[PDB]
Structure formats: C-alpha cells, structure tokens
Design a protein around this ligand. Structure first.
Ligand SMILES: Nc1ncnc2c1ncn2[C@@H]1O[C@H](COP(=O)(O)OP(=O)(O)O)[C@@H](O)[C@H]1O
Ligand code: BEF
Lengths: 250, 365, 781
C-alpha cells in the first residue's frame, strides 16, 4: 500500500494502476481533505480525472479515516451523457462502492426521494445530473453529504444560474470540481467556480471584479497602454498565487 | 527570597520555581515608575502599543493624530533614570503618514525589520523598519478597527483585519491577496486575534455581541460561536449565542493559547475555553469599559500565576486570569486608558491613554 | 568570537531517577539509574550491583520508565529528556558487544505551553497501551504504543484542570484510566479520566472527583488485587477504589513530607515511602477475602535523603539521593536495638549540590585540590577532590554548608554552615557546628515550626576538624563569606555578609558585614557594619571590600581604625547576586539582567557602567575568563560568554558564546587539578558535575569544530538525538545553536571508537595527528 501524511492509505493495486501525475493528484485531493477545503481538478481533458477521484474516494473508504467513518454519502453531479461512464469507471476501479444513478434512466424504479434517502443512509455514491440538482435541491440537501464532486463543474460558471445557486447549497466543505477548462469566457466564471469550492478566497463578486477582472482584462485589449499591461500582469500573478493551492491543472 | 535562592542553589526546587515565583512577585509589585519616562511625541491619544516579540527592545505606538512612534526601551545611559527615547517616527511630514487615527500597530513576528499598522484612513500599511518606507498598502472600503498577524505562523503571513464592515478581511502579505473574507458577523468587527497555539485559528469579536472562532483554512464557516450560558438559553442560532450583552471590543488569548479573554461594553470580561468556546464562568467582577473602538489588553507570561491587564477607565486593572481575583488597579493616567502592553522579560507594563502619555509600570524594588 | 572548550572533570553523581526491571535480559533484574545525563545499567546480583553499561544521553533524563509491550521478551525503556526528546530504547547484547538500540524516538516539545509547576511527569499505562506525559499546564500528551510508531507521534488531550500535582495510571481497568490530584481554588481534589485513543479524548472516570487533603502531593497506583490509588498528603494517607475510602493520619509522618515511594511487592501489599528528612517508612496494605482492610505506616529507620528509591530483592533497597550519597541498604526483619531496620550495605559517592568550592594548593605541591561544599541538610559535607582518576575525601558536616574560603596564613577553611532547629530551639541532630573544639555566638548591638541557625566553621586544613564554630544572631542568615586582607593592615580576616530573615517579609531589609579574625584558636569579632539589605556577595577588590547589598553594589574601605567605610555605590541592578573581579573591573551577575561590566575608576573614586548584556538571563554563576571574556551560567542550564564589543552601543556586551550544559552551575573558580589551552575554570553543579572551561586559539577551535561535526556524522547517540540540538542554547523564550563552545566530551570520545570509524572522521583532514591532539586535550583534567 501507499501511505500519506496522517492516516490515508490507498491500496497498492489501485495505486500501482495510476500514473505519476494521477497519484500526485490523489495526494493533492487528500491535502484538500485535510484542510477541509475544496478544489478544482483542472487537468485538461483526457488526462483522467475520473480515475484520480475514484482512487482518492477508494482510499478514503479503505483508510477508514475519521463524523463519517471512511467515506460518507457522496454526490457526483455530471453531464447526463457520462453518468453511466462514471458508474462503469467506479465498477471497474473500486467495485465495493454502491454507485446509484439519480435519473429517469437510473436503475431504481421507486420514488427518487427514496433513492436519495437510501444513499444518504448507506453511504453510497449518488450520481445525478445538473438538471436534477436544480430540480430536487429540496431533497438533495437534507442529508449532509460528504463530498460534492461536480464533474465538468464549469456548468457552475454563471453565478446566477439556478443550477449554480443549487450546487452552492451543500453544507459540506469537501467540494470538488472536475473541469479541464475552468475558465471559458472571462474571470467571472473562475470566481463562480472558486465561490463553489471555497466561498471566501476570491471575495464577493464586487471585490473580485474590481480587483481582478477589470484590471486583468483591460491589459489584454490591443490598445492597452504599458502601465495597464503591467497592472494586468501584477493582478494575474496575484490571482494565480491566490488560487494556486486549490487548482490542480496538468 | 533567600529561601528561594537556597532552594535553587541546592537543587531542592527547579529553577523554574524561582523564576516564576519571582516574576509573580514583580507583577504584584508593579507600580508607576517615575524612575522611567517615555518621550512624549504624540499630539493625540495613544491607541496602540506593540513591543517587538524578539528581543523585546523596541516599542511601536500609534496615536490618534496619525503619527507612529518607534521607541527604544533599553536604558542605554549609565544613569538609573532614563527616558525611552523615540528612535523613529512616521510623522506629519512623512509622505506615508496616516491621514487619521492609527488604531493598531504590530511588529512582524519572527523579525524586527517589518511592521504593520492600520488606520481609520481605511488602510493597512506595511512598513520596512530600516528604510521606514511603506512596502505595501491594503486599501479597504471601510475604516479599520484592528488588525493582527499570527504570532506563530511560520507558514502563512495573513493579516486578519476588522473594519466597520461585517466581514473579516484576510490580507496575504506574500503575494498580495486581500480577497479572502470571513463572513458570518453582522456588525463592525472590533477585535481580531490569531490563536498563539494554532496557525490558522482566528478569534474575531464584533459589536453584535458575538465572538467567533474561525479556521481560515476551512471552507465551511466559523468553528465556534461563544455563548455566555453554554446552553441554558438555547435557540436556533439566528440571534443568540452572544459572548456579551453589548459590543465585544477586546480579545486576548492567554499565554498558552488554551483560553480566550473577551471584554465587552456590558462592563464584563469573560474567560472561554479556546478549544470548544465554553465559558469557564470565571467571575472577574465588573470591568468598566465603554470604548467605542477596539480595546487592547494583554496577559502576563512566565509567572507562577497568569495575569490580565485590562484598561479600566483611567487605571489599568490587574486580575488573575484563572481565579478572577483583581490583583490591583494601577492608577497613574489622567484620562481613559486605551492600550496596555506587557514586556515579558522584566514584568514591565506600558500603557497608553487619551492624555497623550505612555506610562511605564515597573516592579518596585 | 570566543573559543571555549568545555569538558567533564567529574561526571554528575546525583541520582535524579532510578527504576528496576528486566532490561538487559528476561531473567536479569536490572537497576537503571539516571544521573542527570548518564544512564547507568547495573545487574542486581545477590550481593551489591554489577555495572554492565553506562551510556551518555544527549539530554537531561527527566522521565525514565521501563515497560514491556505484548510479545516483547524483555523490558523496553522509555526516556524523556528535559528538552523533550522522547525515546524507546532496547538493550541488545551480541556477545561482547553491547548496544542500546532506539526502538523509537521523537521530540514532543509543544511550541508553546506553560511547563507545569510540579514538573515533567511521565507515566506508562500498566498494559503499555500508551505513554502519558504531563509537560504543560492544561494539556496531557498521549504517545500511543499499540499503533507501533518509530517517530512517537503524540497527541494532546485538553485537561480541564490546569494545576495537576501528580498523576498515575490505575490498574485493573479495561480502559487506560488516569487518576490525578489537582488544585483548584476550592482545595485539592482527586479525579479520574478514561483515555480514548480512538476518540483521542477523555471520558468520565470510574469514580468521580473526591475532595482530598489540602497538601495531597502523591498518587500511588495500587496493583490489580486492590486496584484504586493511595494519595499521600502531609497529614494523611487515603485510599480510593471508588466506593472504599480508607484514611489514616499516622502521627509519625507529620514531621516531614513524603517525597518518593516504591512498590516492594508485585501485589502492592507493601510500599516504601521516603521523606525529605531521610526517614524511610513502610506502608502496609492488609487484604480481606480481595478487598483492602486498613492502612499501616511503620518507620523502618533512616537513609540518605531519597530522591528516588527502589526495592531490588532480599531486603536490598537502593536509595538514590540527589542531596547525599546514594545508598544500598538492607531491611532487616528485626530492629537494630535502635528501632531501625535499615542497615547501609554500600554507599555511592555523590558530590551533592555543589553550592561553593575553592581550589587550594594544599600539601604545598604544584597540584590544585578542590574543596567543595557538597550536599544539604543532613547530608552536607566537605568533599576534597584530587587527581592521582579523581579521589574524593568526605568530611561529614551533618548540616548544609553554603560557602567556603581558604585562609592560608591561618591553615584553615572558613565554612558557612546552616542547621535546622525546631522549637527556645533544639538541634535535631549533632551537627559539625555543635561539635567544634571551641564555640561562640554573635553578641551584636545592631538588631534588637523550624528555624535555620547559621554558623561560621573554622576547619583545620590538615585534619578537617572543626577548630571553631561561631553561631550568628537569631534569625540571621550568613550568605557570603570572603577571606582576605583589607586596606594596609596585615591581618587576614574572615568577612561574612549576613541578612536578617523574618517571615513577615520577602526580601531582607537588614543585614551586616562582620569582620572576624582567626588567631589563637579563637574567632574574635574585629568589626561590624549595619547594612540595609542582604549581603549576597563580597569580593576583595584591590585592598577594598566590594559588597552587594540587595540591589546596590558598594565598595567599602578598611580604615586605620579597623572599620568599613563606604567609598562608592552603584544602583542600576535588580539584584546583584554574583560579583567577580580582575584588576579594576567588576563583573556583576544579576538575578535577571544577567551581567554588568563595571569599572572602579580610581582617579575619581566611583564606579562606571562600562558594558551590559541586555538579554534577560537569570544567572546562577559568573566568571571572568580574560580581560574581555565573561563566562556566565543562566538558570536554564546554559553557559554563555559575553564580550565587550570590539558610540553608546559600545555599552552592549556581545554574547559571543552559547552552549547548553544541561547542568545548573553554582560556582566558577580559576584553578586546575593537574600540574595549548589558555586558562582553566572549574565549575561545580547541582547534580555533582565538575566541569572545566578553557580558552582555545582560533586555529584549533576551527579544527575541533570540524571534527565535532565529523563525530556527529559518525557517533550515534542513544535516543538518536542530534548533538547540535542538545548543545543548543535553550530558554523558554529563546533558542539558538551553540557557538564558540566545543563539547570536550564529544571530542574526547574520539578515542573510544575503532580505527575504521576514525578514518570516517578524518577523511579530508592523518588520524594519528588527531589522536595526539585529543590526548593533549585530555591532559588538562
Ligand atoms: N491510470 C490509468 N490507467 C488506466 N486507464 C486510465 C488511467 N487514467 C485514465 N484512464 C482511462 O483514460 C480515459 C480518460 O480518462 P477520463 O477520466 O475520462 O478523462 P478526464 O480526466 O477528462 O475525465 C478513461 O476512460 C480511463 O479509463
Ligand atoms: F475530459 Be473531460 F474533462 F472529462
């Protein structure tokens, strides 16, 4: 087995399967756990973020760390096309997990609220979609989930979409975002993502916009004077420093 | 004293015994030293004092006139009488001088070369001691009541800043990041203090009668909200769990960092368990404060019994932390006392006041 | 920078802790003795003790306890160091070779914490599930053992009681259960907690808090048949098992406090209890069929003042004393016709608290010869030390010696002694003051439970018999004592500085300087001088008497009338405790301002504060090495050398030397015990170490520092402690690496290693050169 700083072991076979950067990522996820912070697995598409997440969750269940003993009831919110991709990857990589789908397709065939209840009370992985998170926040948030992995979490990039407000209703500290592109049109999207994983770091959207978005943007227009370019460089350095501990982007 | 010397020399008692019992004797004998004076440089009331943690030689002072004074507390003259001369001063002609009252000044822990000061001009300025020029300025939208650097953080260099805003600003001196905010208070934060024990534990006290303990690493809000009664009056937390029945304008961790002392405008001082925020029910009597800003008070260190020196109107009231028994009240100021700071090497106290004086209290004999 | 070489002339002799167990083998019964930095392993033979190993820890052994984890063949040893180096050591004998392997180690110092008043406690669960350490107020550190560490990861449990006197692990409990006495304003109480290593926190103990005697200071965990605990206070011994409350108040234990204990049996039917007077008691538990019926205390006899005591077997008890010689006594079944069952089998020399010492070239040789005030109340004595190894004579004084000076012209030693009288008053025992040839008492016109009587003993420097004993006034404490000739008259005087000690005050306001002359077997009082404070120190200073009354250092002159007349004063001191002299310069060691270089400018007739060290070091002793190098000893077991630097910053002494000795220096003195190095300063410590500081040149200092680093890279310490960490200057508010000081012990260990290890040392420097160097270095002591 591979052992990390405090009590976190990941099985030797599960660990051997991973690559060097994926196990760096499993480490990084677990320091996030130790500090009770969220973060953005920003490794770009195809590098394997499902596997780092599954390996970390498996080592979280396997290490029996101490409220929840090991892994609690976690929710994975993903685009509708990959819910079954997630189920497949969980069943091949860590079969002991109970991985339910919260969808019409699903596999349950009873009241969905019953599925959410059962997964909350048997510490399963509930795989749902962003649409369902919007529609069933009344039920999805009455159960004190242990992790709130959002796959392709850049669907949270609009701070005012209903999905965004919904996903920001989980009381848990262990929020994770999987998105190889956690910035798509502007810095407001980055603020929204970081406001999900760690609400305070970037300030209120007032402060973030005035301190970072207007400066960092205004130094990229072609006509930008040198002074304003240098301000943009300075503010970009500050922003990268601020978000360094919580973004892992290979 | 001769019994103590004989017991030390012969090994009966650990030398720690003599150190602590004698330091306690020196604290009980603390009295206004007219055999030491501090040079008057402030045109306004002294709001804050900070003796450097390493070597305890130099003192900072922030006045209501916006000047910062840097004093030498070592008696470099061969006389038994000396005045603590003012080495430096950020004066009315200094281009970086604060435009309004300096409400807090703090040495950088771990090194004397940098110190930080916050003002009602809505700035926290970082100063390089040697060149005495600002290295950084953190502008805030609202006037600063109190800032504090962790006395312990070998890892992070965050400054917790409390302004009239309901949020606590965390400013990273390492690459300048003033975006982090701790939200959960509802009124002006009148006092902030990092735990001396835990690198990332911050205690914040606000005019809404609430004191909160935070883990600035954590992404899930305040750890603890101090409650007077510990559950006797229990309510779904929307307005209850107040530390005081007024504004809480002073915070001070005990030396070992296992307890928290709060003073509020209910004319009370309370002692709390800093791990679970449980009131220890130490009485302390009545502590007259009606300060409308942060009230800086200190504790003793390395004595047989710990003490707390709290500004009590124009006097400095000395209490035993863990029994509440008021040792005494040091009366030598002419107006209300704003701040006291303890020199832990010689059990000396310095106290500033609105009467534009800084008085040294040294043990008698 | 200063270049100083520290070495041990006499290793510490005071036994600060001793345990018994099966450490070297499952069948051996070992006696492990902690003298401050030395761990001495003996085998309990049918007669005496056979030494098997003596190791040097890089640490003051604060805790030392043997424990046997499940499956282990023989006892492992847990040691905690004063600097909080924890280690678990195992003894592995491979034929001739002997090793002490470190089964685990770590540093458990909390960065912050108020180190507890009563001092470092270290207990081990009777089932070896955890090591409980009370190091700081309000915290209780737990080192798990079931989670088999190699780094000793430990966690704090917050203890709701902040003033814990003593704590033990109870027996016969499914959970690790601690029982401790703590003091709150409402009195002293005994409380129990159950330790949860899984929850990492306390739980409600088996039996709730109980209000106990006011001076309850000892907890004794009692083995499984009885269970419970026995709390010893001053006037009572009480037994708690949760529902049972036995309580006795034996009148025989009221006279002195019980300070150490030991379980004679495995079943705890008998305990030894040692008190500060040196009495030895046997506490008997009478069982009922099993419950406990009643407690009995019987006085076995007297021993040396025990710090620790251990019952070995067959009535043999090792009484490890810090204040007197350690003892190996026998407990007879029948009394000795004097009421005593204790019979001393063997005595182990202990240069006890060395409170003062002098180097006299007695026998008119070229050899120095230490004479030290060793020991304390009943164990006080003069020890005479000389090379021949070191031979140690003992002159039992039977009372605490305090100072000693040699008057050569008169062929005598003047010794300040102190004896404790009870009632007007009565001597508890015949003390060397009371058996002098002649005697006298101070009849002075200046000033008009148990008390301390102080005498000036004139002792023959051939026979070491008390030629004379002058008792000082009632409630007069003699502190300082100098032998010298003053002014221009030719008589050599014994000058004693005293203080008047009344319980109504914390610092004496009254005292006097008495000038005696010893001639014709009598001690005449030649002069007196009422001073307004305690005379902590007097040095003869260029024909004049330089005394230090409470906070003033003043210089007296000896007038033609033969009286002391003040010449100058100096006041900028908290407490001038230590005075030294070299030429016109006076070094003042303060209670807490630490050193001051004063100059008597004779052209004016007043003092001048030349330089000062502004660091807050609480001195225990001071010395002048050179014109500008000032050795000092802080009460945190550190040596530092100050140096007059090279404006007003010239009034700042520069601390150019720093070194953690691990011993409490009580005295420095120039001299050498022998017939490359410059100067030679001996020092005597509380533990009984005699060490030697001397000045090196820059070249050799560099060489020896290089080889120090090499030996650190090669020699492996017992608890895997780093030498640099051990010698690092340490105070509760400061910590710096050593500098300007070479551990002569580590250097001299360069001989006790095999030749391949030597080449490992001597890679880039030949070896035989350094063998010559280190031999020449050992020549100095
Ligand atoms: N260490 C690995 N060993 C074997 N297959 C892997 C490993 N890492 C990733 N994969 C495979 O690579 C594919 C792409 O990874 P995926 O997690 O979908 O990428 P993303 O990081 O964009 O989510 C997955 O189907 C997965 O099975
Ligand atoms: F490649 Be995707 F971000 F899973």
């Amino acid at each position: 087995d591979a052992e990390f700083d405090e009590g976190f072991k990941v099985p030797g076979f599960l660990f051997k399967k991973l690559f060097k950067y994926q196990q760096t990522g499993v480490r990084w996820l677990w320091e996030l756990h130790c500090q009770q912070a969220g973060g953005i697995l920003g490794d770009e598409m195809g590098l394997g973020k499902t596997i780092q997440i599954i390996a970390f969750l498996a080592g979280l269940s396997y290490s029996k760390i101490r409220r929840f003993e090991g892994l609690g009831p976690t929710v994975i919110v993903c685009p509708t096309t990959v819910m079954h991709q997630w189920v497949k990857e969980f069943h091949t990589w860590w079969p002991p997990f109970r991985v339910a789908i919260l969808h019409e397709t699903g596999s349950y065939t009873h009241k969905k609220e019953k599925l959410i209840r059962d997964v909350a009370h048997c510490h399963g992985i509930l795989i749902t979609s962003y649409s369902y998170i919007r529609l069933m926040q009344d039920d999805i948030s009455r159960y004190d989930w242990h992790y709130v992995i959002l796959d392709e979490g850049h669907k949270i990039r609009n701070p005012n979409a209903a999905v965004t407000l919904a996903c920001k209703q989980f009381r848990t500290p262990h929020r994770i975002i999987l998105s190889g592109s956690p910035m798509q049109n502007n810095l407001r999207e980055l603020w929204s993502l970081f406001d999900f994983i760690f609400p305070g770091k970037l300030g209120t959207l007032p402060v973030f916009m005035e301190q970072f978005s207007v400066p960092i943007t205004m130094g990229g227009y072609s006509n930008a004077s040198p002074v304003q370019v240098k301000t943009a460089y300075k503010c970009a350095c500050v922003l990268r420093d601020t978000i360094n501990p919580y973004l892992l982007r290979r | 004293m001769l019994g103590f010397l004989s017991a030390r020399q012969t090994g009966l008692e650990d030398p720690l015994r003599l150190r602590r019992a004698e330091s306690t004797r020196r604290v009980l004998g603390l009295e206004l030293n007219k055999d030491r004076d501090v040079e008057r440089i402030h045109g306004g009331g002294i709001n804050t004092l900070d003796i450097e943690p390493v070597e305890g030689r130099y003192m900072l002072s922030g006045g209501s006139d916006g000047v910062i004074v840097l004093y030498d507390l070592e008696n470099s003259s061969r006389q038994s009488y000396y005045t603590c001369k003012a080495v430096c001063s950020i004066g009315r002609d200094h281009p970086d001088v604060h435009r309004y009252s300096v409400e807090t000044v703090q040495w950088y822990p771990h090194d004397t070369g940098m110190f930080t000061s916050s003002s009602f001009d809505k700035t926290l300025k970082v100063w390089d001691t040697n060149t005495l020029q600002t290295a950084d300025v953190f502008n805030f939208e609202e006037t600063v009541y109190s800032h504090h650097m962790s006395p312990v953080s070998t890892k992070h260099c965050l400054v917790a800043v409390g302004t009239r805003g309901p949020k606590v600003q965390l400013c990273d001196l390492k690459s300048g990041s003033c975006s982090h905010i701790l939200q959960g208070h509802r009124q002006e934060i009148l006092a902030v203090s990092w735990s001396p024990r835990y690198d990332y534990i911050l205690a914040t006290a606000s005019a809404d009668s609430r004191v909160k303990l935070w883990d600035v690493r954590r992404a899930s809000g305040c750890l603890i909200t101090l409650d007077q009664h510990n559950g006797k009056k229990s309510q779904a937390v929307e307005s209850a769990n107040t530390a005081h029945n007024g504004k809480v304008n002073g915070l001070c961790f005990t030396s070992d960092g296992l307890h928290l002392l709060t003073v509020g405008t209910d004319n009370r001082m309370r002692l709390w368990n800093s791990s679970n925020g449980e009131n220890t029910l130490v009485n302390y009597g009545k502590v007259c404060n009606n300060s409308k800003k942060g009230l800086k008070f200190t504790v003793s260190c390395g004595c047989s019994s710990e003490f707390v020196f709290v500004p009590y109107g124009s006097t400095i009231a000395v209490y035993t932390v863990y029994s509440g028994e008021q040792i005494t009240m040091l009366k030598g100021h002419y107006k209300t006392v704003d701040c006291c700071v303890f020199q832990s090497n010689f059990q000396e106290l310095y106290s500033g006041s609105r009467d534009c004086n800084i008085l040294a209290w040294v043990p008698s004999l | 920078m200063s270049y100083n070489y520290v070495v041990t002339a006499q290793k510490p002799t005071a036994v600060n802790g001793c345990v018994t167990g099966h450490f070297t083998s499952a069948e051996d019964l070992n006696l492990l003795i902690a003298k401050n930095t030395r761990l001495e392993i003996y085998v309990v033979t049918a007669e005496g003790l056979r030494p098997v190993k003596e190791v040097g820890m890089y640490g003051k052994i604060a805790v030392m306890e043997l424990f046997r984890p499940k499956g282990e063949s023989k006892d492992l040893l847990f040691i905690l160091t004063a600097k909080y180096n924890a280690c678990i050591l195992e003894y592995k004998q491979s034929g001739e070779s002997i090793d002490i392997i470190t089964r685990a180690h770590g540093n458990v110092q909390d960065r912050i914490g108020r180190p507890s008043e009563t001092g470092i406690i270290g207990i081990i669960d009777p089932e070896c599930r955890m090591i409980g350490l009370r190091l700081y107020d309000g915290l209780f550190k737990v080192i798990p053992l079931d989670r088999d560490n190699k780094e000793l990861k430990a966690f704090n449990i917050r203890l709701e009681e902040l003033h814990v006197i003593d704590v033990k692990f109870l027996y016969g409990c499914q959970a690790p259960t601690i029982c401790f006495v703590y003091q709150d304003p409402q009195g002293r109480h005994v409380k129990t907690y159950e330790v949860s290593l899984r929850e990492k926190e306390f739980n409600k103990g088996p039996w709730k808090q109980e209000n106990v005697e006011a001076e309850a200071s000892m907890v004794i965990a009692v083995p499984e048949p009885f269970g419970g605990a026995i709390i010893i206070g001053q006037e009572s011994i009480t037994y708690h098992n949760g529902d049972k409350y036995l309580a006795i108040a034996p009148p025989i234990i009221k006279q002195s406090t019980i300070v150490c204990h030991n379980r004679v049996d495995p079943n705890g039917s008998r305990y030894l209890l040692g008190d500060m007077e040196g009495r030895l008691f046997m506490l008997l538990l009478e069982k009922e069929e099993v419950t406990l019926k009643d407690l009995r205390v019987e006085l076995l006899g007297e021993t040396s003042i025990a710090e620790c005591l251990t019952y070995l077997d067959n009535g043999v008890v090792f009484v490890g004393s810090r204040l007197g010689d350690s003892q190996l006594v026998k407990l007879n079944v029948d009394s000795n016709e004097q009421g005593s069952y204790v019979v001393a089998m063997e005595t182990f020399t202990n240069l006890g608290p060395i409170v003062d010492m002098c180097v006299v070239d007695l026998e008119r040789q070229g050899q120095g010869q230490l004479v030290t005030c060793s020991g304390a109340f009943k164990e006080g004595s003069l020890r005479i030390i000389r090379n021949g190894k070191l031979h140690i004579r003992t002159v039992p004084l039977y009372e605490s010696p305090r100072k000693i000076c040699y008057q050569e012209v008169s062929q005598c030693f003047g010794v300040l002694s102190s004896r404790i009288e009870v009632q007007g008053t009565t001597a508890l025992r015949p003390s060397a003051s009371t058996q002098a040839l002649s005697s006298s008492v101070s009849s002075s016109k200046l000033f008009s439970e148990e008390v301390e009587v102080h005498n000036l003993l004139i002792i023959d420097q051939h026979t070491f018999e008390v030629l004379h004993a002058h008792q000082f006034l009632q409630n007069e404490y003699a502190l300082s004592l100098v032998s010298c000739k003053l002014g221009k008259d030719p008589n050599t005087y014994f000058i004693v500085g005293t203080a008047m000690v009344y319980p109504e005050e914390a610092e004496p306001k009254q005292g006097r300087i008495v000038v005696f002359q010893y001639s014709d077997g009598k001690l005449q009082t030649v002069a007196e001088k009422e001073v307004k404070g305690a005379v902590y120190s007097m040095v003869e200073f260029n024909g004049k008497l330089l005394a230090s009354i409470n906070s003033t250092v003043r210089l007296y002159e000896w007038t033609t009338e033969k009286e002391l007349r003040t010449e100058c004063n100096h006041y900028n001191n908290i407490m001038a405790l230590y005075l030294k002299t070299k030429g016109d310069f006076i070094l003042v060691g303060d209670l807490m301002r630490s050193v001051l270089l004063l100059a008597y400018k004779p052209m004016e007739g007043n003092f001048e504060e030349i330089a000062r060290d502004f660091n807050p070091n609480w001195m225990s002793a001071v010395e002048i090495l050179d014109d500008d190098n000032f050795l000092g000893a802080e009460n945190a077991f550190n040596l530092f050398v100050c140096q007059k630097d090279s404006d007003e910053e010239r009034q700042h002494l520069q601390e150019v030397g720093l070194f953690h000795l691990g011993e409490f220096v009580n005295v420095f003195c120039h001299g050498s015990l022998v017939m490359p190095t410059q100067g030679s300063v001996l020092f005597g410590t509380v533990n009984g170490m005699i060490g030697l500081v001397t000045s090196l040149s820059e070249s050799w200092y560099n060489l020896l520092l290089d080889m120090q680093n090499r030996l650190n890279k090669v020699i492996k310490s017992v608890g895997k402690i780093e030498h640099s960490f051990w010698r690092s200057f340490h105070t509760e508010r400061k910590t710096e690496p050593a500098t300007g000081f070479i551990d002569g012990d580590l250097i001299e260990s360069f001989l006790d290693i095999s030749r391949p290890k030597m080449q490992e040392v001597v890679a880039n420097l030949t070896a035989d050169d350094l063998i010559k160097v280190v031999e020449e270095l050992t020549r100095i002591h």
